[PDB]
Symmetry: C3
Subunit: 188 residues, 3 copies
Amino acid sequence: MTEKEKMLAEKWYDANFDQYLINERARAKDICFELNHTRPSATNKRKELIDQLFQTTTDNVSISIPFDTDYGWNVKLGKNVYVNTNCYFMDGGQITIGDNVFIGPNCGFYTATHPLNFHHRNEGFEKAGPIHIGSNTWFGGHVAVLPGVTIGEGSVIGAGSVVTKDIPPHSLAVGNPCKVVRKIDNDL
Amino acid sequence: MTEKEKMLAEKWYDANFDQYLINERARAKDICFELNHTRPSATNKRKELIDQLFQTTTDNVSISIPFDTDYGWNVKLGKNVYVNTNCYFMDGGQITIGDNVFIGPNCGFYTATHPLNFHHRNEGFEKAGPIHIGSNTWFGGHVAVLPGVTIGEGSVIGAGSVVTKDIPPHSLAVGNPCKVVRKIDNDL
Amino acid sequence: MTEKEKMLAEKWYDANFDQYLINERARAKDICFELNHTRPSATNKRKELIDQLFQTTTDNVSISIPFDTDYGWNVKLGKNVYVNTNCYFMDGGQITIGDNVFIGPNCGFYTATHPLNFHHRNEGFEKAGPIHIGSNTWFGGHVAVLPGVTIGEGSVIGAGSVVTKDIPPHSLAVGNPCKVVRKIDNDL
Ligand SMILES: CC(C)(COP(=O)(O)OP(=O)(O)OC[C@H]1O[C@@H](n2cnc3c(N)ncnc32)[C@H](O)[C@@H]1OP(=O)(O)O)[C@@H](O)C(=O)NCCC(=O)NCCS
Ligand SMILES: CC(C)(COP(=O)(O)OP(=O)(O)OC[C@H]1O[C@@H](n2cnc3c(N)ncnc32)[C@H](O)[C@@H]1OP(=O)(O)O)[C@@H](O)C(=O)NCCC(=O)NCCS
Ligand SMILES: CC(C)(COP(=O)(O)OP(=O)(O)OC[C@H]1O[C@@H](n2cnc3c(N)ncnc32)[C@H](O)[C@@H]1OP(=O)(O)O)[C@@H](O)C(=O)NCCC(=O)NCCS
């Protein structure tokens, strides 16, 4: 397998020294830079950049600057997704975001693990753990979501949370580590 | 009431689809953008932008870039307020900052709540909870202050704190959630 | 002593009103601004700026934008140091970083303490507590490292950690406050 295929199959891959992945990260980063230096009221320019970054035709995806991602094409987005300032979608592992998602400022969605053993880590290896973000969710600011985590549909993550484990749907969860506090009444 | 008046009166308001608030947020964001792209040594330009953003004549308010706010005019500032890099004053609810305030880097002052019910939330409703920051205070970096929180005068908030409840004056408080650790001797 | 010499000797110094330190912070902040506004693929320009900022000839030090530091020359770097987006090396106290160091996004390395007494603090005084970062270390994103803290070689700091005390070598440590969870097998 290529190191890309490895990455996408949840296997250890050489994130650092693989030329194809290096170049793909460089593509995303230069688009992020342009976007981060595009005036917020330049609506069409920003939409075009966002669509180029994510390699998709977004439907009411609003990204406040600055924004960062590793690949861009490995973030799959629903409609009506509001991302406030200073978020980072580190998407070596796929980041799936549903519809009607409110993301607070300074949130990081982190799919990259490195080996704990420094000898393996220094050789460039990573393993990507996909993140799935349910539809109809809200994240407060300053949240980190760690590799492999799924947040169920209808759930609310409190500001400052570090989400180390999956959160069931219809749940209010807060803290470091993030723990479910109570169920949310999502009735019509 | 207009949605603005609702916002300012602590009532549920349509933050997302109200044109007047949309345009007011767009005003602030374009000023922030200009300020964030103004060389740090361009003293006068930065002061003029800051005064335009906050709609006031500031006295020794120093804002390190980047900075963000939603309205700008809903942040009321004392003199001698030092705001380090990457702070966000999300001021739908008023944010009152006293004199001689030191704000560390990456601090978020968050006044916005959304409904927990995703049906109400997806309709664009928010409720703003004012933040009051006492005079003679110090915030470490990476702090988040949540809606409705008052930090008393003379108090110190430790780096990484998530401040969910009011902090009494003359207090050292740290943690997630932030809790008072001890009293501070602020004697002359 | 000059206030610089005081700063570097772990004594209370006037950080705010000393002209020489003010001008040194202005040098670093204008280099950061240029760097933060240099296209990520402008490899040689970014290296020249990084070497100017740190006043050294770096060996495979890669800094993702944006980046911030107070002095630049008070950060001493090994080789193979990877710094992801939105870090702040607040280096009034020396920040020593070893070889083969992976630093996650939105990490703050904070050497500045202010007096707790608001009277002394408002007079501009600080005391700098050096940070030492071991070789062969990995920091997840959203980590704050507080003044005086040493992280031993071969150690891993989990995302969201607030590191208030020294962490021994060969350790996995996480949390707010950060606590050692287990030893890491770093064997060849
Ligand atoms: C969780 C949240 C939604 C508030 O929920 P809440 O249940 O009304 O808050 P409560 O008063 O019930 O707090 C319940 C307990 O949980 C704690 N708590 C609430 N939010 C917390 C958080 N984010 N982190 C840690 N603890 C938290 C409170 O300290 C409280 O402690 P107690 O056991 O002494 O009562 C809060 O994070 C919030 O407002 N988040 C969004 C803020 C924000 O980021 N806005 C910007 C994005 S729009
Ligand atoms: C709170 C602070 C001032 C340290 O204060 P301190 O007087 O050293 O407090 P202590 O170390 O006596 O605190 C006692 C306990 O609180 C804990 N603690 C201290 N700061 C903490 C924080 N920020 N978060 C969580 N726990 C903290 C310590 O781990 C200590 O644990 P113990 O039970 O093992 O003793 C620290 O947050 C700080 O320096 N903040 C500013 C650093 C910074 O952000 N600088 C950049 C902006 S200038
Ligand atoms: C700790 C970390 C490094 C991985 O370690 P890990 O082996 O999953 O941790 P463990 O499972 O041994 O730890 C056991 C406990 O620690 C908790 N934990 C793990 N990471 C944590 C974190 N960052 N903060 C708080 N708690 C954490 C778990 O909830 C678990 O609880 P339990 O034992 O009660 O179930 C995690 O932060 C991580 O994935 N870090 C990198 C993520 C990142 O930032 N990537 C971007 C930069 S590449």
